[PDB]
From a paper:
Strong evidence has implicated the lipid kinase PI4KIIIβ, a phosphatidylinositol kinase widely expressed in mammalian cells, in the replication of several RNA viruses, including HRV, due to its signalling pathway. As a result, PI4KIIIβ is an appealing target for prevention of HRV-driven exacerbations in respiratory diseases. Inspired by the renaissance of covalent inhibition as a mechanism to target proteins of interest, this strategy was chosen for the development of inhibitors of PI4KIIIβ with a prolonged duration of action. The aim of this project was to develop a selective irreversible covalent inhibitor of PI4KIIIβ which targeted the conserved lysine (Lys549) in the ATP binding site.
Numbering used by the authors: 304 to 405, 515 to 801
The structure:
């Protein structure tokens, strides 16, 4: 039978490492400790233990100790590890694999990292070898992240059911204690910040260079991916009221999708903004340009997807609300503030509106999301003065 004590000890071992990292002040010293800690871990591998974020049956065979990184200098600094596993068909009928004798991490292309680690590993030759990643957070409450994950998965199910081609990428969350857990990061994606820094290009010119020129299938495909993911995250950001959007917490993948990460401030999280914002989702000049501009066909597609996505969401509203209620009862998180949280969430599904009214609302919301475009300061004085322009 599959024993749970080995798994418990495995997970505990990852969390124990963090307490020892906390004894050191700088990220550099923490990283040095972490490498040594993971080296010890390999004494006990392979074993009948698994990474629950895998999503497929496997055994852990190795942790490439030199490849792990601590992410900051905080007392309970997150740390990122890579974990080698051997996939198996059926866990409970598979034997434990035999042991085989023996800044850049974030920017570096995933396929390059997989290549190097595979080359260095005694297990890298096996066809069922896979590389996983987790970020261990010993001092962060991840229950808000878990709630977001659950809601994001439900929206994907809803959009699939309603045949709306919105795209999002939920990332897996394990809640360990009330103030610790793990995350499976999104790989093969780079923050918008880093893409722009390394390339010194606008997003459009980056797309043109990386995917292809205007007349190419690759450009159009990438543009479509961008639009579908933009619309998906627009709706995520609105319905869950995700704050603190910037180019550090929006990632771009190799297919042209954007991916929002870090839902620290959702629903009734403090501080509530004072800027009369509908959402922290912003549509910048750069983003609109990737979509072919304000009069662009792909921008029109964006707006259509937003409408159809919202129609789909309200059609299945109870499936989302239930998730949030189940969490609110079981826990007591800072994203909740009494009974107004659920009321306000339901109100964002606009159940009283006709689809005609919803369409007008979407036009309004999209206009709002573009308010920080310089042109808006330039071209909206009719609302601020008795002039008609
Ligand atoms: Mg006026």
């Amino acid at each position: 039978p599959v024993r749970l004590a080995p798994e418990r000890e495995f997970i505990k071992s990852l969390m124990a490492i963090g307490k020892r990292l906390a004894t050191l002040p700088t990220k550099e010293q923490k990283t040095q400790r972490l490498i040594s800690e993971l080296s010890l871990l390999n004494h006990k591998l392979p074993a009948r233990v698994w990474l629950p974020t895998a999503g497929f049956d496997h055994h852990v065979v190795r942790v490439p100790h030199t490849q792990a990184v601590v992410l900051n200098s905080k007392d309970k600094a997150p740390y990122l590890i890579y974990v080698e596993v051997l996939e198996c068909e059926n866990f409970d009928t598979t034997s434990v694999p035999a042991r085989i004798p023996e800044a850049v991490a974030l920017k570096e292309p995933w396929q390059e990292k997989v290549r190097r680690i595979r080359e260095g590993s005694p297990y890298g030759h096996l066809p069922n070898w896979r590389l996983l990643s987790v970020i261990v957070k010993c001092g962060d409450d991840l229950r808000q992240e878990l709630l977001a994950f659950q809601v994001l998965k439900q929206l994907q199910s809803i959009w699939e059911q309603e045949r709306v081609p919105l795209w999002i990428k939920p990332y897996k969350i394990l809640v360990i204690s009330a103030d610790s857990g793990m995350i499976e990061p999104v790989v093969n994606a780079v923050s918008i910040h880093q893409v722009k820094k390394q390339s010194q290009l606008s997003l459009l010119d980056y797309f043109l260079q990386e995917h292809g020129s205007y007349t190419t299938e690759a450009f159009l495909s990438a543009q479509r991916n961008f639009v579908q993911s933009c619309a998906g995250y627009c709706l995520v950001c609105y319905l869950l009221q995700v704050k603190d959007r910037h180019n550090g917490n929006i990632l771009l993948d190799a297919e042209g999708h954007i991916i929002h990460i870090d839902f620290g401030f959702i629903l009734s999280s403090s501080p509530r903004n004072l800027g009369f914002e509908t959402s922290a989702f912003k549509l910048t000049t750069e983003f609109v340009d990737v979509m072919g501009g304000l009069d662009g066909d792909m921008f029109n597609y964006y707006k259509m997807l937003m409408l159809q996505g919202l129609i789909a969401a309200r059609k299945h509203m109870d499936k989302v609300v239930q998730i949030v209620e189940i969490m609110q009862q079981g826990s007591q998180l800072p994203c909740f503030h009494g009974s107004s949280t659920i009321r306000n969430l339901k109100e964002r599904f606009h159940m009283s509106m006709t689809e005609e009214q919803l369409q007008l609302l979407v036009e309004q919301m999209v206009d709002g999301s573009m308010r920080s475009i310089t042109t808006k300061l330039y071209d909206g004085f009719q609302y601020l003065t008795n002039g008609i322009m």
